[PDB]
Every structure is written in structure tokens, then in C-alpha cells.
């Protein structure tokens, strides 16, 4: 962006170190940065202290009927929209009555999960560049529409460079990754099959790192991940450790996700996920561990001693049949012991809970478990979806809070309807009765991308129609689903 903007009159949640809230607050931005944030009258002094040239073109946004938030940082996300017709998706009968416990449910089917994750590379290769771009753009637009200004890929069924291109075009921030799986649990062999050379998987991530260095927007970073500790060799783990030290990067993986994980890990690898990561030298401040609930006392102590990070998705565990909240209570207990814990959406093949829905879930579920309405305050849920997530992503230098020097990444929500009436804590009303759909305005680096809940830098109808066309092509050609099953569903879409 170019020029100064003053967003004044609303309640401003900063998610700074003090979790500061300013009723009748203001945010002054110049180009892509926040320069001043506080009470309207304090910020008005900063305006009078600008270069006259800058003040003369200052745009004033009246936000008195609005709440101002930092942009959501969704640090644990997967692009999976290519599986819309197959994965718990568009071909199910409308009735749910015949549904069965499957996949992640009932403790986890570890063989099926391992095998499914090892198949990703083959399905990515079956995708056209246009299908990748069209599906990435729509999938990432849905995140942006729900207030996500910084999105973290932790392993996607899509082409990394298609997703980088989608992020560049949409105007949002993206931490790109590659799919990394070099082992599969084969029960008929009584061993893991080493499915790939660790060094080839690491070279692919270095090729992505080289391509993202060439992007000049400052909006694209990358972070290597391992799909899941079941699908990781010692050689992949040691290589990731060496790569993240050499390039000074964050690192992400899924670990302690499922009840049946530890038993499969001991049987096939001879050791549980966190202890294998710890041996490789990966349990340290760089680590974002997805889920990380099924940890014994030694593994909890390794996470605390390393000052690691856990990303938690309490909005989506129930519908997947996962028990990564209440079966162990470990993630809330590690948060109480001073571990950084952020909130993330995870993802599915169809639209599911956004950050706003995940913030509500944490606020309900952590407080209920501890019989304590102060364990997660609404401003805690916000910090867990903004500043603390940015810290796990190692992007808190630039995003996650409204503070002088950080990027002008912010959301406006309308607070003038019955849901907000008389509440001096509009964030609380937002967690009670609002969601992703209630994000009104989205600004990234001082540029408005969304306004009145509408994209102002995209053709929403085009994003939708290209996604449906891409999904049809990929589903019929790559997934070999008959056109007879696909076309009736696409004919029912309300355009």
C-alpha cells in the first residue's frame, strides 16, 4: 500500500504483550506498517506529527460501528479441496444415519492414515498446473474471507508453487511447504517401508526455498514440515534438523495426535514421536507440533525444556472422532506450565471451522475442563490465533499484533446489531454469536482485500467457477470418479 490511513472510533484489540484493548481506539498506518495505535486522541497527536504531504492524503476510515482485530494467523493448515468429492465430501448421502467411526476416529486407524499420507505425492503429480492454481486460489480465498491474513501450509495435496502464486495474487501472507513422507507402516510386512530417499525430499524443500527467495513482495516465506512421525525416518528427521539450522527456519510436524499413535510408533520405529524428534535435535524453539496431546511425562518435559510450540484445533476434533483435548488434558496443562499454544483450523476437503470458530471452541472447552472462566479469556483466544501463532510460525517480527513497526494486517467486524448491544467486550459477543462470515473488512500491508464481506481484489464468481471446473477435471481424470456421479452434484450448485 501507499499513503496514510487512520481507522478511528471502534474498540481496538491489539494482541500486544499486555493484551491491550482500546475502546474508542485508533490505528494509524503509513504504507504497509502500523505507526500508532491507542486511544483516538493519542493517535490523533501522531497524525499531527506526520510530514504535511502524508497528512494531506490521509484517508480516514470511520470504525465507530466496528471492532478492530489483528489479522488471524492460521499457522496449521492443509490445502485439501482437491478431495472435495472423495474425502468425507460431496458424494455422501444427505442422511448421516449410516455414518461409521473411520480414519482418525476411535483412537486412529494408523495403517490407513500412514498409507493415505504416503499416496499424496502421486495425487499431486496427477494434478494439472491450472487445477492446482484454481483449487489453491479458492481454498486460500476461503481462509482470507474468514479474516486469515497469514496462512501456514503444514503439508498440502497441491503444488507448492501453485499455492505461492495463489498467495501472491490474493494479496495475503503464506508460509509455503512441501509434502514430506519417506516411510509407510505396512502391517503385512511387520515393518515400515522406506518409500523415498530423505535427501530427495530435502532437495525438493531447498528448490521451494530458492523459488520463494525470488518473490519480492515480502508476503511469502517457507517452513519445512514432516507429514506425520509415522511416515518419517531417522534420516529425514536428522536432515530436517540440519536444514532448519543452516537456513534459520521454523519446523512443523504432526505428533502425539492419536491414542493409537504411541503403540504403532514403538512397534514400527521402536520409539514415540516426540522422543524421535528430540533424538534428531528437532524439539526446540523452532518446532510447531500439530495436536501434541498423547505425550507422557518425559515428552511433556522435553517440550517445556525445548520451549517448543503446540498448534491445537479444538474446533474440529469432535467431527473427526479425535480426542486430542479431553482424553489426556495435556495441551491445556502444558499451556498452564508456560508452553506457547496457538489455535489453528487444521483443514478438510470442504469448508469447515475457521479461526473465529476455533477461538470460540478454545474459550468454551478449556474453561469448562478447568471449571475456570479465566483459563482462556476472550483476549487469550485472540492472542492464540494472532501473536502466539505468529511466534510459532517465526513471523511475529512482522505480524500477529497491532503495534508500531508491525505490518498493517487487521480485520473490521460490524458491532452495531443485537448480538453486540450494550456489551463493552465486543470480542466476547463475537465468540458467542459470530464467525468467519461476520468478517467485514480485511487489510494486509495497508491494502483492503475484503470490504462489506466482499472480495475487492478478486472475481468471487470466477474463483468459485474455476474451482468447480478444476475439481471436476481432477475428480474424473485423477480420482477416476464417474462423470455420472459428479455432474448431478455440479448441476445443483446455485450460481
> Helix, strand or coil for residue 334?
helix
Residue range at the interface with a copy of itself (CB under 8 A); choices 35-43, 190-198, 249-257, 485-493: 485-493
DSSP code of 424? S
**Binding map of a copy of itself across residues 425-464, x = CB under 8 A, - = no contact:** x--xx--xxxxxxx---------------------x---x
Cα–Cα distances (Å) from 379 to 45, 223, 329, 374, 428, in that order, read 27, 27, 22, 10, 9
Largest CA distance in the chain: 75
Q: Which of residues 50-109 bind a copy of itself (CB under 8 A)?
A: 64-65, 84-85, 89-97, 99-102, 105-107
18 binds a copy of itself (CB under 8 A): yes
79 belongs to the binding site for Zn ion (CB under 5 A): no
Confirm if 436 and 147 have CB atoms less than 8 A apart. Answer: yes
Residue 489 as a binder of a copy of itself (CB under 8 A): the answer is yes
Of the candidates 287, 373, 379, 378, the one whose C-alpha atom is nearest the C-alpha of residue 334 is 287
**Three cell numbers, residue 417:** 446489531
153 is an interface residue for Zn ion by CB under 5 A: no
Q: How many residues bind a copy of itself (CB under 8 A)?
A: 95
Say whether residue 346 binds Zn ion (CB under 5 A): yes
Q: Is 48 among the residues that bind a copy of itself (CB under 8 A)?
A: no
State yes or no: 76 annotated in a binding site: yes
247 is in an annotated binding site: yes
142 interacts with, out of a copy of itself, Zn ion, none, CB within 5 to 8 A per kind: a copy of itself
Contact (CB, 8 A) for 135 and 81 = yes
Name the residue among 222, 226, 175, 176 with its Cα closest to residue 196.
226
| Footprint of a copy of itself on 364-383 (CB under 8 A) | 364-374, 376-379
The yes or no reply on residue 16 touching Zn ion (CB under 5 A) is no
**What residues are paired with 287 via a beta bridge?**
251
CA distance 242 to 401: 31
Q: Give the residue with the Cβ less far from a copy of itself, 48 or 374.
A: 374
Q: Which of 27, 30, 31 is nearest to 8 (CA)?
A: 27
Length of the chain: 495
Residue 145, contacted partner among Zn ion, a copy of itself, none, CB below 5-8 A by kind:
a copy of itself
Should residue 317 be labelled a site residue for a copy of itself when binding is judged by CB under 8 A? Answer: yes
Least distance (Å) between residue 9 CB and a copy of itself: 10
Cα 414 to Cα 208: distance, rounded to the nearest angstrom: 39
Q: Which parts are annotated binding residues for 3-hydroxybenzoate? A: 291, 322
Residues that bind Zn ion (CB under 5 A): 290, 346
Amino acid at each position: 500500500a501507499m499513503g496514510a490511513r487512520l481507522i478511528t472510533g471502534g474498540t481496538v484489540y491489539t494482541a500486544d504483550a499486555q493484551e491491550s484493548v482500546h475502546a474508542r481506539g485508533a490505528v494509524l498506518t503509513v504504507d504497509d506498517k502500523v505507526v500508532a495505535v491507542g486511544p483516538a486522541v493519542e493517535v490523533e497527536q501522531a497524525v499531527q506529527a506526520l510530514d504535511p504531504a502524508v497528512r494531506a492524503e490521509l484517508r480516514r476510515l470511520d470504525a465507530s460501528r466496528m471492532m478492530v482485530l489483528p489479522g488471524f494467523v492460521n499457522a496449521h493448515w492443509h490445502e485439501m479441496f482437491a478431495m472435495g468429492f472423495t474425502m468425507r465430501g460431496a458424494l455422501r448421502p444427505p442422511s448421516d444415519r449410516a455414518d461409521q467411526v473411520a480414519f482418525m476416529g476411535g483412537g486412529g486407524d494408523m495403517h490407513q492414515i500412514s498409507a493415505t499420507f504416503d499416496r499424496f505425492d502421486g495425487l499431486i503429480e496427477a494434478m494439472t498446473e491450472d487445477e492446482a492454481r484454481a483449487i489453491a486460489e479458492y481454498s486460500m480465498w476461503i481462509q482470507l474471507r474468514g479474516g486469515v491474513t497469514t496462512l501456514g501450509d503444514m503439508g498440502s495435496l497441491n503444488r507448492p508453487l501453485a499455492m505461492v502464486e495463489a498467495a501472491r495474487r490474493l494479496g495475503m501472507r503464506f508460509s509455503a511447504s512441501t509434502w514430506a513422507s519417506d516411510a509407510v507402516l505396512a502391517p503385512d510386512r511387520s515393518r515400515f517401508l522406506r518409500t523415498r530417499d530423505a535427501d530427495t525430499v530435502l532437495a525438493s524443500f531447498e528448490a521451494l526455498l530458492g523459488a520463494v527467495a525470488a518473490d519480492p513482495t515480502g508476503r511469502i516465506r517457507c517452513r519445512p514440515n514432516v507429514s506425520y512421525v509415522t511416515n518419517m525416518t531417522d534420516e529425514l528427521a536428522r536432515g530436517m534438523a540440519e536444514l532448519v539450522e543452516r537456513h534459520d527456519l521454523p519446523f512443523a510436524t504432526h505428533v502425539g495426535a492419536l491414542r493409537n499413535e504411541a503403540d504403532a510408533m514403538r512397534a514400527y520405529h521402536g520409539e514415540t514421536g516426540v522422543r524421535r524428534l528430540a533424538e534428531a535435535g528437532l524439539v526446540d524453539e523452532r518446532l510447531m507440533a500439530g495436536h501434541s496431546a498423547f505425550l507422557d511425562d518425559q515428552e511433556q518435559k522435553l517440550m517445556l525444556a525445548g520451549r517448543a510450540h503446540i498448534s491445537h484445533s479444538p474446533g474440529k476434533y469432535g467431527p473427526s472422532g479425535e480426542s486430542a483435548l479431553t482424553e489426556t488434558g495435556v495441551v491445556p496443562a502444558l499451556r498452564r506450565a508456560g508452553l506457547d499454544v496457538s489455535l489453528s483450523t487444521d483443514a478438510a476437503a470442504l469448508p469447515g471451522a475457521g479461526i473465529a470458530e476455533t477461538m470460540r471452541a478454545a474459550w468454551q472447552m478449556y474453561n469448562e475442563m478447568s471449571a475456570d472462566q479465566t483459563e482462556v479469556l476472550p483476549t487469550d483466544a485472540l492472542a492464540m490465533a494472532t501473536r502466539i501463532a505468529a511466534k510459532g510460525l517465526r513471523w511475529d517480527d512482522a505480524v500477529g499484533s497491532l503495534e508500531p513497526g508491525k505490518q498493517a494486517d487487521l480485520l473490521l467486524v460490524r458491532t452495531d446489531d443485537w448480538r453486540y448491544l450494550l456489551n463493552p467486550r465486543p470480542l466476547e459477543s463475537f465468540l458467542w454469536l459470530a464467525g468467519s462470515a461476520d468478517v467485514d473488512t480485511v487489510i494486509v500491508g495497508g491494502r483492503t482485500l475484503v470490504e462489506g464481506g466482499r472480495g475487492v481484489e478478486v472475481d468471487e464468481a470466477a474463483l468459485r467457477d474455476r474451482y468447480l471446473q478444476a475439481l471436476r477435471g481432477f475428480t474424473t481424470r485423477a480420482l477416476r470418479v464417474p462423470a455420472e456421479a459428479v455432474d448431478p452434484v455440479l448441476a445443483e450448485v446455485a450460481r
